[PDB]
Design a protein around this ligand. Structure first.
Ligand code: IPT
Ligand code: IPT
Ligand code: MG
Ligand code: MG
Ligand code: MG
Ligand code: NA
Ligand code: NA
Ligand code: NA
Ligand code: NA
Ligand code: NA
Ligand code: NA
Lengths: 1011, 204
């Protein structure tokens, strides 16, 4: 049959989908969610063999272990065991587009297990097996006999083995195909892997059983009353004596319960469902569920006899909440949400696509600690445990069908084709059937990047009809089609329109008000965090706060999809597209997260945490106004700490308890202040601290902060008369300045400061020269590649204009002795192919104090592309342990990504001034810096800087961080100006105009002084 | 102004004058102005100005220099935005070109007198024997800012001797979204803290 090449067959003998079951035979166990003896895990060691195609699988395999197989851990992805290569492609399919066929060479994983089954399981009832996730399709045999087949890699496939097992030892054989017609609907931008990658389990249910159950909660106007309704269905023999009881508990207290025999109300002329019953329970003043306070009740569904003997029980966590769109706003419990979301793929650098509880918990805690309240299951239903954690820890979830056909031409080729409706429909229906009882799921999504086809409209309507409690969204086809309740664009900009034909991406503020438009807008994806990115993040937040209908969005994305590989030294390193011989591949595009694969944060993370704060502040004289953005809770685990410092020197600090109602304000009056004993800028910094530990945070957790400048006292006191005067020695090739034990040498041929001495100790490894380029960020490169340049990418503009190749021509170099100092004047032009790109005019003034004052005035040709930076750079001979500065920090910050950073005195190890992006680039800048200390050197002024052991050259020529090697000494880049990094997307220029260096004339000045 | 420093130095081919001043009020330092004037053998005087504005004082209306010239010339010629008066948040209509008008046209006779007649984005200005080059905004007329500020009606303005030149490195927006509450947009407020500008003054 070749069922894997026929979208008309997506399963054979597969049981109906339903919500999580455990078949408890004890009510108390169901109530407490304890392990069920009727649900067993078959995870662990299995036997596995790899074949190139299904036709190479020996028949002997069905009845006997292949001697050549290996024992491996399941769940797993076989690529993660080295059987074949994982493939990283973004849009283009990993297989020839020729639906519904797949390649003849189709990697096949042959898994098997010999296990035991207790007699009691077979003496009565039904024994099924459950594969929570098999990628991408498979046939199943038990004791050599064929059982069934299944598709959809991200939903459980269940089969009844009751007629195939024997007491004692049994052998399962599962033939997993890497490619199938289901791969046409599995084109998500992620590694393409395969295998039995989710749990395997055996579930025993009684013959007469609970086959399905749905829980709904409705409320009165103010949510002070609710009605819990549970529809329950049965399979097996109907008996008048059967009953269902549904009881609801709060903690250890049963708050409501109802019992009825089966037999639903009349539905139509033919009657009603004799095999169903719906129980209705009243709930007074229910404790409502939200991401802010995830209150849960427990519903227990008992199937039993009238005389009270239990047959079995099922149960679930219930969260009393209402989700509705009204007057254009998405409301939760009647208040408008502000989604602080992120897209999160199921990725582990070691285990591939297998997910584990510990990793999931770590993700949720870091999300919450960083002010996220929502997550999108980009782009498929997740491992079942995920929903349970989101219900209990409190996160809003977008559950999304496993449908993505991005690489089709046009995008909706399959989605508009009726022959594909059936396959699509099960990816949507089976998700709803499985997840509709989880309170955390608040929105359903029809899939991703599959254009807009009639199939979407059909499925949109199916969900609306079956589950009116949750809005339905889908971005394909322009993000505002008839198949979406929410305008949910991906990467639409705040102010700038991108009027692409057919599927324009308007400015989000403009989009809301298009004629006739009334829905809310929540970006399904925005702020593409690829590499050094999130430039412009604050721009989105400001708009979300100002426009009611702009209800937030989901950052793309949570974690880098890098994979571990091991070098010749067995040292592990982070790998991306192409590193496994996979080709074609999409190289570094698989890495777009706020965190590295091991969950270590990238610098953008703090920018997100700060912008997503739940408390807003205003300062008026001595009053601080704090406003709460919580919708449901009071600030009952919060205190405000405030600190006043003069140029980093502490002056005063205090704490004040915060008692703000949701959406309320509190004014805090600050203490009269002492005066600063001297010149400088006074800064006020406030932070909200949670003194108590929570389920997701430690005691002392900082949830929000803000700073302001208070009084500044300009310095007018003239320094002190130095008693030494520097001396100038002129030669044909140089100008040398001596000041006791210090010397400075300016080369007359180059026009630069070539060497500096402290005594006999030389300070420089390379001369101090202007620099107007940067090792290109991912956002500067975009999709450009050597084999296919994208001439509009910033890097290509700079390259083509010769910025990287430009050479300095000296225009002038003179020396003047002043009364108390020596004055060096220089001028240089950078040209390319006859064109003057930049002109740098400088002065270096060295006085008796040992300070060298450098003034820089640069002209940039209006017609050349705006340069990446306007600064100087040098390779210092010293390597010191610490870096200390007065400026923005402490983490890496750029012009369009510096709101999170605070101005203060920072001190860190040199290695922390380097951000180890997997694909290396300019990194580690710190802006708004007034003083920088390193070794015996001190630089003062108002600049941006980076300092590390890697030159820009090395960074730009090295494609993987692991291949970087510390250079001799320390490279210092000090910029008067630096271009923004962008990130609205990582495929088209995204640096906003205000962050481009287009002034034409630039001026900056620094003073370098040492020991 | 409070003089902080004033020095003179002889260069290989020039004379260099360095100054520094503080403007204070009731003991608070509002602004600090640091300059150099370099006079070379070609007769050109290059003036470099670097100013600091206390972050806590209200952003100032302008950052420039002024002086009353003895000369009263008939025309005003400049390479910059024109020909009509234009301000930083009101200059889209003006075109960059070479403009030449009679002096009187460099003054706008608003009924209630005020700062007026500025022209922005100028690279060269010529008046009488003088020439100023750089990248600045300027106004020129027979009325001082002091007189304009003190006269409520244009008919009572009197030409002073000479000509008043206000040449600015930076000038604040004029606003107008309304005329009863501050309306100058943040991006046109002089809130940078530190400002730099340079002008060359010469003859012909
Ligand atoms: C590269 C663009 C043409 S498609 C762009 O690629 C991204 C890479 O992370 C994401 O997959 C986005 O969802 C997709 O729209
Ligand atoms: C019963 C409460 C959860 S809501 C209750 O539902 C009623 C219909 O049953 C009416 O609509 C009431 O107006 C409403 O408050
Ligand atoms: Mg099929
Ligand atoms: Mg895609
Ligand atoms: Mg701030
Ligand atoms: Na909003
Ligand atoms: Na490629
Ligand atoms: Na990607
Ligand atoms: Na509190
Ligand atoms: Na690189
Ligand atoms: Na007046």
């Amino acid at each position: 049959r070749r069922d894997w090449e026929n979208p008309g067959v997506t399963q054979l003998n597969r049981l109906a989908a339903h919500p999580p079951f455990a078949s408890w035979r004890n009510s108390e166990e169901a109530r407490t969610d304890r392990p069920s003896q009727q649900l067993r895990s078959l995870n662990g060691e299995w036997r596995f063999a790899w074949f190139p195609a299904p036709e190479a699988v020996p028949e002997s395999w069905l009845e006997c272990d292949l001697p050549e197989a290996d024992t491996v851990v399941v769940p797993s992805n076989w690529q993660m065991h080295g059987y074949d290569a994982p493939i990283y492609t973004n849009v283009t399919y990993p297989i020839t587009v020729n639906p519904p066929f797949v390649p003849t060479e189709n990697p096949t994983g042959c898994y098997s297990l010999t296990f035991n089954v207790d007699e009691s399981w077979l003496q009565e009832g039904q024994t099924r097996i459950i594969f929570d996730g098999v990628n991408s399709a498979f046939h199943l045999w038990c004791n050599g006999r064929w059982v069934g087949y299944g598709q959809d890699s991200r939903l459980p496939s269940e089969f009844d083995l009751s007629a195939f097992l024997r007491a004692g030892e049994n052998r399962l054989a599962v033939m997993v195909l890497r490619w199938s017609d289901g791969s046409y609907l599995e084109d998500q931008d992620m590694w393409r892997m395969s295998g039995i990658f989710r749990d395997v389990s055996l579930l025993h249910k009684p013959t007469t059983q609970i086959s399905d159950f749905h829980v709904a909660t409705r409320f009165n106007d103010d949510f002070s009353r609710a009605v819990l309704e549970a529809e329950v269905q049965m399979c097996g023999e109907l008996r008048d004596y059967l009953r269902v009881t549904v009881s609801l508990w709060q903690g250890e207290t049963q708050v409501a319960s109802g019992t009825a025999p089966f037999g639903g109300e009349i539905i139509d002329e033919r009657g009603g469902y004799a095999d169903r019953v719906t129980l209705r329970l009243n709930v007074e003043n229910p404790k409502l569920w939200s991401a802010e306070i995830p209150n849960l009740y427990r519903a227990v569904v008992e199937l039993h006899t009238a005389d009270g003997t239990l047959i079995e029980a099922e149960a679930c966590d219930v969260g009393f909440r209402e989700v509705r769109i009204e007057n254009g706003l998405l409301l939760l419990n009647g208040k408008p949400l502000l989604i602080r979301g992120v897209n999160r793929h199921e990725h582990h650098p070691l285990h591939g696509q297998v997910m584990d509880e510990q990793t999931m918990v770590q993700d949720i805690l870091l999300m919450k600690q960083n002010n996220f309240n929502a997550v999108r299951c980009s782009h498929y239903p997740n491992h079942p445990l995920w929903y349970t954690l989101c219900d209990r820890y409190g996160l809003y979830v977008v559950d999304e069908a496993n449908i993505e056909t991005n690489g089709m031409v046009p995008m909706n080729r399959l989605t508009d084709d009726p022959r594909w409706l059936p396959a699509m429909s099960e990816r949507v229906t089976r998700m709803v059937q499985r997840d509709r009882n989880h309170p955390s799921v608040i929105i359903w999504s029809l899939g991703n990047e599959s254009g807009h086809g009639a199939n979407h409209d059909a499925l949109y309507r199916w969900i609306k009809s079956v589950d009116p409690s949750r809005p339905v969204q889908y971005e394909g086809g322009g993000a505002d089609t008839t198949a979406t309740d929410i305008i949910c664009p991906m990467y639409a900009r705040v102010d700038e329109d991108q009027p692409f034909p057919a599927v324009p991406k308007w400015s989000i503020k403009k989009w809301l008000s298009l004629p006739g438009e009334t829905r809310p807008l929540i970006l399904c994806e925005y702020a593409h965090a690829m590499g050094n990115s999130l430039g412009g993040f604050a721009k989105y937040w400001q708009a979300f706060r100002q426009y009611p209908r702009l209800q937030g969005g989901f950052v793309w994305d949570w974690v880098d999809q890098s994979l571990i590989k091991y070098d010749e030294n067995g040292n592990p390193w982070s790998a991306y597209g192409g590193d496994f011989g996979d080709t074609p591949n999409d190289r570094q595009f698989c890495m777009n997260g706020l965190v590295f694969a091991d969950r270590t944060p990238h610098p953008a993370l703090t920018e997100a945490k700060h912008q997503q704060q739940f408390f807003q502040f205003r300062l008026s004289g001595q009053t601080i106004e704090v406003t709460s953005e919580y919708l449901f809770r009071h600030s009952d685990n919060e205190l405000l700490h405030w600190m006043v410092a003069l140029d980093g020197k502490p002056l005063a600090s205090g704490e004040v308890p915060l008692d703000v109602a949701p959406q309320g304000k509190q004014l805090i009056e600050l203490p009269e202040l002492p005066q600063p004993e001297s010149a400088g800028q006074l800064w006020l910094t406030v932070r909200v601290v949670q003194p108590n530990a929570t389920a997701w945070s430690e005691a002392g957790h900082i949830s929000a902060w803000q700073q302001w400048r208070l009084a500044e006292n300009l310095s007018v006191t003239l320094p002190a008369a130095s008693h030494a005067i520097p001396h100038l020695t002129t030669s044909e090739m140089d100008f040398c300045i001596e000041l006791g034990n210090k010397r400075w040498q300016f080369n007359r041929q180059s026009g630069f400061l070539s060497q500096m001495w402290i005594g006999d100790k030389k300070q420089l490894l390379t001369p101090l020269r202007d620099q107007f380029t940067r090792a290109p960020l991912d956002n500067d490169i975009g999709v450009s590649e050597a084999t296919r340049i994208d001439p509009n990418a910033w890097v290509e503009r700079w390259k083509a204009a010769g910025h990287y190749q430009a050479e300095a021509a000296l225009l002038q170099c003179t020396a003047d002795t002043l009364a108390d100092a020596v004055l060096i004047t220089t001028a240089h032009a950078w040209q390319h192919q006859g064109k003057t790109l930049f002109i740098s005019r400088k002065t270096y003034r060295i006085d008796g104090s040992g300070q060298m004052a450098i003034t820089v005035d640069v002209e940039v040709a209006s017609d050349t592309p705006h340069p990446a930076r306007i600064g100087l750079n040098c390779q210092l001979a010293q390597v010191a342990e610490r870096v200390n500065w007065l400026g923005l920090g402490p983490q890496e910050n750029y012009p369009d990504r510096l709101t999170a950073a605070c101005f203060d005195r920072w001190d860190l190890p040199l290695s922390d001034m380097y951000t180890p992006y997997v694909f290396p680039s300019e990194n580690g800048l710190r802006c708004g810096t007034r003083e920088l200390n390193y070794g015996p050197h001190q630089w003062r002024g108002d600049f941006q800087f980076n300092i590390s052991r890697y030159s820009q050259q090395q960074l730009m020529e090295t494609s993987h961080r692991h291949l970087l090697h510390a250079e001799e000494g320390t490279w210092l880049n000090i910029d008067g100006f630096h271009m923004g990094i962008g990130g609205d997307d990582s495929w088209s220029p995204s640096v906003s105009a205000e962050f481009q260096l287009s002034a034409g004339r630039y001026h900056y000045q620094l003073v370098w002084c040492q020991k």
